[PDB]
Amino acid sequence: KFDLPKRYQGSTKSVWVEYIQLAAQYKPLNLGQGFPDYHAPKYALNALAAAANSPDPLANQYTRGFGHPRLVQALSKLYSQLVDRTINPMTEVLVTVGAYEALYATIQGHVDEGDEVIIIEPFFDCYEPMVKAAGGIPRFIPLKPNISSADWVLDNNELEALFNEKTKMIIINTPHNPLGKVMDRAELEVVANLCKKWNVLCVSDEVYEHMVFEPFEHIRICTLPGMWERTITIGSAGKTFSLTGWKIGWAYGPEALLKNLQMVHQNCVYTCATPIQEAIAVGFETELKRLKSPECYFNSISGELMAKRDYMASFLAEVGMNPTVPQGGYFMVADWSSLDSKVDLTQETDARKDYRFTKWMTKSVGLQGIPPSAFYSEPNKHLGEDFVRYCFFKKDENLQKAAEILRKWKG
Amino acid sequence: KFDLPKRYQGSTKSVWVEYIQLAAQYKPLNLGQGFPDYHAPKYALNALAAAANSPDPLANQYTRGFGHPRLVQALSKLYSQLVDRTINPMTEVLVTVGAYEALYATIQGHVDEGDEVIIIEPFFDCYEPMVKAAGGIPRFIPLKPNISSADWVLDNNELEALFNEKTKMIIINTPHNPLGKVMDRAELEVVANLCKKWNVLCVSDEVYEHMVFEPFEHIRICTLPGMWERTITIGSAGKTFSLTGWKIGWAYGPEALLKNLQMVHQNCVYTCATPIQEAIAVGFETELKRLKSPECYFNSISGELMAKRDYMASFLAEVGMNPTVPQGGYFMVADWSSLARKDYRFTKWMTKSVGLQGIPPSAFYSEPNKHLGEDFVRYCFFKKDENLQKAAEILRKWK
Ligand SMILES: [Br-]
Ligand SMILES: [Br-]
Ligand SMILES: [Br-]
Ligand SMILES: [Br-]
Ligand SMILES: [Br-]
Ligand SMILES: [Br-]
Ligand SMILES: [Br-]
Ligand SMILES: [Br-]
Ligand SMILES: [Br-]
Ligand SMILES: [Br-]
Ligand SMILES: [Br-]
Ligand SMILES: [Br-]
């Protein structure tokens, strides 16, 4: 009687669980955690401590359900500048439990039974189960390499063909997790034109918006002609400020679209943590004062990461993988398949080769990455099997340890 | 094309979205939503600052999806003592964004299309729209006064009549919001017996578990014979430690039932805030060392609140209302009638004209039964004494 309801049938644990257990068992040099292994900007940490210690007793009591006022004010001040439109802080911004819950409120609020939703593989892992749980029908299309993340592209004919009147939503993720692909203007117009043609909602997951490397540029699809009225754009304080344990994010867009998200949110979590939102608001006000200065965190994070990106691409090419150099973000996918005659995966029991390889590497060599086949639909999982995802948001000494491990191993 | 999906059709802003806005607009003395207007235990606030300031770079990054290990360990340690069983911290506890998301995970996780769910009126208002979003069919029965919250009782015959082959779940809330009713053992046994007869899951919303007044006692339904296997119990750090802005709660119960909640949670928020869970774990470890002490916050909150409860019942009775004196919690319902739906118009009038905000209890009834709440008002008395005095004086002069 108490089995999962239909909309959840065949739910399983995320890939993260077994990889966290694997890391605890073997204690590898861990390049699988998508978060830094050093500390976030001190102004932000100090702001959380100040909110805990606040002399205002209301600092740690309930705040406004759709978002703490100081925070939605700051979010509107920033994004209004970026999108060149004044965004209403009360009706056109919704604060959520991470970008994760902004995706959840968006998909539950706008996907009904039978609605088709286009998802681009490799997908952020929640897109498929959230669409399924809403009674939607996912329609998958993969990015495939033609190297740079710019070389991983969609087949436009395939994409055009997937859209029709039953398409309710497309989810795009730029910069992309985990490729680092930054959609260029032409790629954004491809999506925007199909969305206008078919009257589709575009949900743009832009959590890595501040982490684009020179000479690329983050462009927001909501600014394209006719897109404001049919786009919901999503960001994350965890990704903006490198504080993934804070779990606060947001959706912004027209009030008409945000109403559906508000109905979901108000009877899912109702409201989000007050002192965390206060600290994040302080973080935004700090950056708003120096937005054009190089020490703004929004501007400095890319140069901080680029040296690390380059160092990883170099050591991975040296051991004989072929890395896809990302245009943004802190993940790198590499093709390990030329090492396959140099590794013994015969005692690895998983169905897909990149699980076998990543588990073998943790156990044998003490270096942990993540299997990108986890981010494909079952019929396209073969496209992930030659690859591995690493994170380079790591202390230099740990990147150097990873390099040493691979040097030793090749020797 | 972009209307609400069917499962949300007819949705409107909740009483809380509406009333928080009214409060921001008119800046009344706010005796509405339950929270204290004074500082929570220092040890908890200190622990949050310590987590913000931690030298451990993992303290502010993602933690375990089903709950931060230090917190679920503390929760198992406390609740294993209270329920007289070893609760598995990894499989029988789930941490959530408040008791709100624990209710959400529970209802989504165990209510499928056409399952009937029994809700007891007046109900904490999220129960109904959560059932409806899951495709469930709510069935309602009201508590009615026969004063004390003990005097608000259901008809047992009407309750039994609600149980049938389609009943999947009954939600109980004790101590109760808004009445402060504390279910006694006989009342718990009525529900337990019917759940066992009809193979129904009991969801017990126990956020106010530590706020029972003498001479009453909180009893956990999951301890009744045969009830462990079919109960999910919910709590809240916001209510346990008087830190409502922290929004961390939990469900506990048998592994078989908790699996469903894990799947919904995983695909909803994934994980909850790390430093907040760390601070709450420190708070539980602090209290676990002194469980029978008068200084233990689980023990002291009732004494603190009781004087405030009695002060409010006295001033409400003095102005001509008839209060229901709660057996636990920090809310009081009173019948204002000797002075769209009437109680909405009353609470709104009071906020705007005399600057004193309460809550309309018709928000906690099904549409057909809203008339049962129209003559009442809900006030929160978890406030500094100077502000309870201010309410007394606002009402005295309004009279
Ligand atoms: Br885990
Ligand atoms: Br990991
Ligand atoms: Br700083
Ligand atoms: Br272009
Ligand atoms: Br264009
Ligand atoms: Br750069
Ligand atoms: Br537009
Ligand atoms: Br209120
Ligand atoms: Br996890
Ligand atoms: Br409803
Ligand atoms: Br007492
Ligand atoms: Br049992």
Side-chain angles (χ1 to χ4, degrees):
Chain A
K1 177 161 174 179
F2 299 98
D3 289 340
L4 268 160
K6 287 162 293 273
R7 61 194 176 268
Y8 272 103
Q9 286 179 288
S11 294
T12 58
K13 271 167 168 82
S14 307
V15 69
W16 319 116
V17 180
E18 66 195 271
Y19 280 83
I20 285 163
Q21 181 247 79
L22 186 77
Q25 192 84 297
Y26 290 92
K27 297 295 187 186
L29 195 292
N30 196 346
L31 302 174
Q33 298 165 144
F35 55 77
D37 65 0
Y38 56 103
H39 301 271
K42 190 54 155 52
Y43 67 79
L45 297 160
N46 287 352
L48 181 55
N53 290 321
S54 174
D56 181 356
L58 298 202
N60 291 271
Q61 305 307 328
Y62 288 129
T63 197
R64 170 175 176 278
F66 300 160
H68 188 52
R70 191 180 188 172
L71 182 52
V72 301
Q73 292 297 158
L75 287 167
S76 169
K77 250 263 259 151
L78 178 62
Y79 290 102
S80 295
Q81 297 179 252
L82 299 172
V83 307
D84 198 25
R85 152 189 308 269
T86 77
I87 292 165
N88 189 317
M90 303 298 269
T91 61
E92 292 178 338
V93 177
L94 175 64
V95 176
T96 53
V97 184
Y100 209 100
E101 188 233 331
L103 289 159
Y104 186 71
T106 299
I107 292 161
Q108 286 283 137
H110 285 289
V111 178
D112 204 349
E113 303 281 327
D115 283 332
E116 290 190 4
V117 178
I118 297 168
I119 296 176
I120 293 168
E121 294 163 313
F123 46 78
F124 181 67
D125 79 322
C126 75
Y127 299 170
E128 171 175 29
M130 283 185 181
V131 169
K132 288 174 160 257
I137 299 167
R139 307 287 294 150
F140 294 103
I141 182 177
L143 294 159
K144 298 189 285 195
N146 272 171
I147 97 159
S148 165
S149 54
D151 303 317
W152 286 64
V153 298
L154 305 174
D155 181 321
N156 292 330
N157 282 20
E158 186 183 359
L159 184 67
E160 287 167 21
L162 214 54
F163 274 85
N164 57 54
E165 79 283 355
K166 302 193 289 179
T167 311
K168 177 72 178 280
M169 181 183 282
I170 182 165
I171 308 168
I172 70 173
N173 173 211
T174 191
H176 186 266
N177 177 351
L179 294 167
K181 178 180 179 68
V182 167
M183 289 173 78
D184 69 18
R185 173 72 186 222
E187 289 173 325
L188 292 173
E189 285 181 29
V190 166
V191 170
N193 291 330
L194 288 161
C195 286
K196 282 173 284 188
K197 175 162 175 166
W198 296 104
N199 188 25
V200 180
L201 173 64
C202 184
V203 179
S204 191
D205 180 340
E206 294 189 12
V207 303
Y208 298 111
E209 63 190 317
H210 304 294
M211 301 187 200
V212 174
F213 303 114
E214 293 289 358
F216 313 103
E217 186 187 344
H218 183 74
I219 294 175
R220 299 179 166 73
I221 203 176
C222 72
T223 64
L224 267 61
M227 290 304 287
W228 176 259
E229 289 294 322
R230 59 175 62 267
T231 306
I232 294 174
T233 306
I234 289 167
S236 169
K239 318 291 179 55
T240 289
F241 295 105
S242 307
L243 291 155
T244 60
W246 288 16
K247 292 291 300 186
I248 291 290
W250 40 84
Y252 64 85
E255 177 166 35
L257 294 178
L258 265 54
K259 219 78 149 248
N260 298 36
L261 280 60
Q262 292 168 353
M263 302 296 82
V264 177
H265 176 78
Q266 75 173 8
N267 283 295
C268 173
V269 304
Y270 168 64
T271 190
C272 301
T274 306
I276 296 182
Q277 287 184 82
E278 177 73 358
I280 295 166
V282 169
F284 281 114
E285 288 172 16
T286 300
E287 298 297 2
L288 282 166
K289 286 182 196 218
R290 65 181 182 186
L291 216 59
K292 322 312 167 311
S293 195
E295 82 287 2
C296 176
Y297 194 55
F298 312 150
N299 298 333
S300 72
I301 190 168
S302 292
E304 176 176 6
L305 288 169
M306 172 185 276
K308 294 174 187 291
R309 181 195 74 175
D310 294 346
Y311 188 88
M312 171 171 289
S314 170
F315 72 63
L316 288 179
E318 181 82 87
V319 75
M321 305 195 191
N322 291 326
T324 290
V325 175
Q327 290 155 293
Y330 49 56
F331 294 120
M332 180 171 303
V333 168
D335 181 339
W336 60 269
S337 67
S338 74
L339 296 182
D340 101 282
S341 84
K342 290 209 170 235
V343 298
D344 176 355
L345 305 186
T346 57
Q347 293 180 31
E348 287 303 327
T349 61
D350 282 316
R352 294 290 169 185
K353 294 184 289 177
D354 56 322
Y355 279 66
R356 299 194 194 135
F357 173 73
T358 49
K359 287 179 182 181
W360 184 89
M361 290 287 287
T362 280
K363 295 169 189 185
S364 307
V365 194
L367 183 62
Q368 180 139 310
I370 289 289
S373 70
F375 311 124
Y376 292 76
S377 67
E378 298 279 351
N380 296 350
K381 280 182 183 298
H382 66 97
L383 291 175
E385 281 186 88
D386 290 348
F387 296 90
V388 52
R389 182 194 84 172
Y390 296 117
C391 185
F392 55 81
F393 199 178
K394 305 280 171 253
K395 282 176 218 197
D396 289 329
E397 68 189 77
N398 287 334
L399 290 175
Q400 191 178 221
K401 283 173 176 32
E404 293 163 39
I405 284 162
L406 297 166
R407 254 24 227 103
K408 124 233 144 142
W409 178 52
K410 175 167 169 75
Chain B
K1 179 154 175 179
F2 302 101
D3 285 350
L4 293 166
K6 276 180 256 62
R7 67 195 164 253
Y8 282 104
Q9 278 178 23
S11 301
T12 55
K13 324 212 211 173
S14 73
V15 63
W16 309 110
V17 175
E18 177 181 355
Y19 277 70
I20 277 56
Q21 159 73 283
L22 183 67
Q25 190 157 332
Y26 291 87
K27 289 280 143 55
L29 177 51
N30 182 155
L31 303 187
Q33 191 185 30
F35 57 90
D37 65 350
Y38 58 104
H39 287 89
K42 190 84 178 328
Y43 62 77
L45 297 165
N46 286 349
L48 179 62
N53 292 322
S54 182
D56 180 354
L58 295 159
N60 290 269
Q61 306 306 326
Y62 289 136
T63 195
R64 177 173 170 271
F66 296 167
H68 189 52
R70 196 183 179 166
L71 178 53
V72 298
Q73 291 293 349
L75 291 163
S76 174
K77 187 149 192 286
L78 178 67
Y79 287 107
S80 293
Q81 298 176 64
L82 307 177
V83 312
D84 189 27
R85 89 155 48 215
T86 303
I87 295 173
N88 186 310
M90 297 308 139
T91 58
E92 297 185 320
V93 181
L94 171 70
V95 181
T96 56
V97 178
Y100 253 89
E101 191 230 332
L103 291 158
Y104 188 76
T106 297
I107 292 162
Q108 290 283 129
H110 287 288
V111 176
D112 200 354
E113 297 235 70
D115 288 338
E116 294 181 13
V117 177
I118 303 170
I119 296 169
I120 297 165
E121 297 159 315
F123 52 93
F124 181 62
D125 55 298
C126 76
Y127 301 164
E128 183 184 13
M130 290 184 178
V131 172
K132 298 189 160 169
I137 303 173
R139 304 283 310 281
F140 304 96
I141 178 175
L143 298 159
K144 296 182 248 68
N146 67 22
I147 77 173
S148 173
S149 57
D151 304 315
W152 287 69
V153 293
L154 45 76
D155 180 309
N156 293 153
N157 298 319
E158 171 180 12
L159 178 69
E160 291 171 28
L162 252 27
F163 281 81
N164 68 72
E165 89 200 314
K166 291 310 280 151
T167 312
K168 178 61 164 300
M169 182 180 284
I170 179 160
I171 296 165
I172 67 172
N173 172 213
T174 190
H176 183 260
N177 177 355
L179 296 166
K181 181 173 174 76
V182 167
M183 287 176 71
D184 65 25
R185 193 180 216 294
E187 288 171 331
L188 291 166
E189 287 181 8
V190 169
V191 173
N193 290 336
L194 287 159
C195 289
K196 290 177 278 181
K197 179 177 174 164
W198 292 94
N199 190 25
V200 166
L201 168 62
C202 182
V203 177
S204 189
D205 180 344
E206 299 186 9
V207 299
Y208 302 116
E209 60 195 306
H210 302 300
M211 305 184 197
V212 179
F213 305 114
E214 287 266 55
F216 309 105
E217 200 198 7
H218 181 73
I219 299 184
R220 298 182 165 74
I221 205 175
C222 73
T223 62
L224 263 63
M227 288 302 288
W228 179 258
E229 69 167 346
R230 59 170 71 263
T231 306
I232 292 160
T233 305
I234 287 167
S236 169
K239 313 305 188 28
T240 290
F241 294 107
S242 303
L243 284 162
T244 62
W246 283 20
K247 287 297 293 192
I248 294 289
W250 52 82
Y252 67 87
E255 186 177 354
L257 298 180
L258 262 263
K259 280 193 240 245
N260 296 40
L261 275 58
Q262 294 175 164
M263 298 298 91
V264 175
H265 173 82
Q266 184 176 80
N267 292 310
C268 175
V269 301
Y270 194 77
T271 192
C272 303
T274 309
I276 295 184
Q277 288 184 83
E278 179 75 356
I280 295 163
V282 169
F284 277 115
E285 294 172 3
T286 294
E287 297 296 3
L288 275 160
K289 286 164 183 193
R290 59 175 190 189
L291 289 182
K292 39 98 56 71
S293 171
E295 290 187 29
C296 175
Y297 197 59
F298 306 152
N299 296 334
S300 69
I301 195 168
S302 287
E304 180 175 16
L305 289 169
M306 179 188 275
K308 297 171 192 293
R309 180 198 71 174
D310 290 348
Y311 186 89
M312 176 175 282
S314 183
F315 76 69
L316 289 182
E318 85 177 334
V319 73
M321 307 199 190
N322 302 325
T324 295
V325 179
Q327 295 153 288
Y330 51 43
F331 296 118
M332 185 167 297
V333 162
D335 175 350
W336 60 270
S337 68
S338 87
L339 305 182
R341 33 298 154 105
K342 277 204 195 152
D343 60 328
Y344 273 72
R345 85 175 59 112
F346 176 76
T347 56
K348 280 178 173 175
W349 177 46
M350 301 281 275
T351 283
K352 71 180 167 220
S353 316
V354 309
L356 181 63
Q357 180 133 315
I359 287 297
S362 71
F364 304 121
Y365 283 90
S366 65
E367 184 85 331
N369 292 357
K370 287 179 174 293
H371 71 269
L372 296 174
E374 71 186 349
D375 288 350
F376 290 89
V377 53
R378 187 194 83 177
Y379 297 117
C380 178
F381 56 79
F382 197 10
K383 306 300 168 174
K384 292 188 182 198
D385 290 343
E386 61 179 273
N387 291 321
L388 303 168
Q389 296 164 196
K390 190 176 174 177
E393 183 65 5
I394 286 167
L395 262 4
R396 186 197 71 88
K397 140 252 79 165
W398 162 66
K399 203 262 190 70

